[PDB]
């Protein structure tokens, strides 16, 4: 079955710019700005739309070695990005896939809000733990903060 988790966070960066950097240039930025969270991102197949497979490797000493993520949808208008964890890490005989949905909304102050949905699909019913969910949210925040800091510091980047 499916376990559904939703979380929200804010950014000081406008939605369009953040979407261009944090979502659309993730393969490039994550290992550059957050090397202690993501060691590399390899494009396995595809040119960046639905079905594109990427292999995300974690640094030495992390709980997991790598995950394979697949792009599900990319909406450039409404800054929505759906992707699934499809192999590696938590995926195996207890968890088939994690489907994720990220939407970035502009706020009046010039910042943005990110709305994050994570659906865990389980082999029958292997209870997804609060600690797996925390770890996921934390890694996303670490990633978001490293990118945010790079965009604050490099005003020419992603205009």
Ligand X SMILES: C[N+](C)(CCCS(=O)(=O)[O-])Cc1ccccc1
Numbered residues of the known binding site for brassinolide: 54, 81, 83, 100
Cβ closest to ligand X, residue 117 vs residue 122: 117
Site string for ligand X, 27-66 (x = CB under 6 A): x-------------x------------x------------
What is the gyration radius of the CA atoms in the chain, in angstroms?
15
The Cα 142–Cα 117 span in angstroms is 17
Query: For ligand X, which residue of 15, 37, 116, 146 counts as binding (CB under 6 A)?
Result: 116
Burial of 92 (0-12, 13-18, 19+ CB in 10 A): exposed
Residues that bind ligand X (CB under 6 A): 23, 26-27, 41, 54, 69, 81, 83, 102, 114, 116, 140, 143-144
């Amino acid at each position: 079955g499916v376990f559904n988790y939703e979380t929200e966070t804010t950014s000081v960066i406008p939605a369009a710019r953040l979407f261009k950097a944090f979502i659309l240039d993730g393969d490039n930025l994550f290992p550059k700005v957050a090397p202690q969270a993501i060691s590399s991102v390899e494009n396995i197949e595809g040119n960046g739309g639905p079905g594109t497979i990427k292999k995300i490797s974690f640094p030495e000493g992390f709980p997991f070695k790598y995950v394979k993520d697949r792009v599900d949808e990319v909406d450039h208008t409404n800054f929505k990005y759906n992707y699934s964890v499809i192999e590696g890490g938590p995926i195996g005989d207890t968890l088939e896939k994690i489907s994720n949905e990220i939407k970035i909304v502009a706020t009046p102050d010039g910042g943005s809000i990110l709305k994050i949905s994570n659906k865990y699909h389980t082999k029958g019913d292997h209870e997804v733990k609060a600690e797996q969910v925390k770890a996921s949210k934390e890694m996303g925040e670490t990633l978001l903060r490293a990118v945010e800091s790079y965009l604050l510091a490099h005003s020419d980047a992603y205009n």
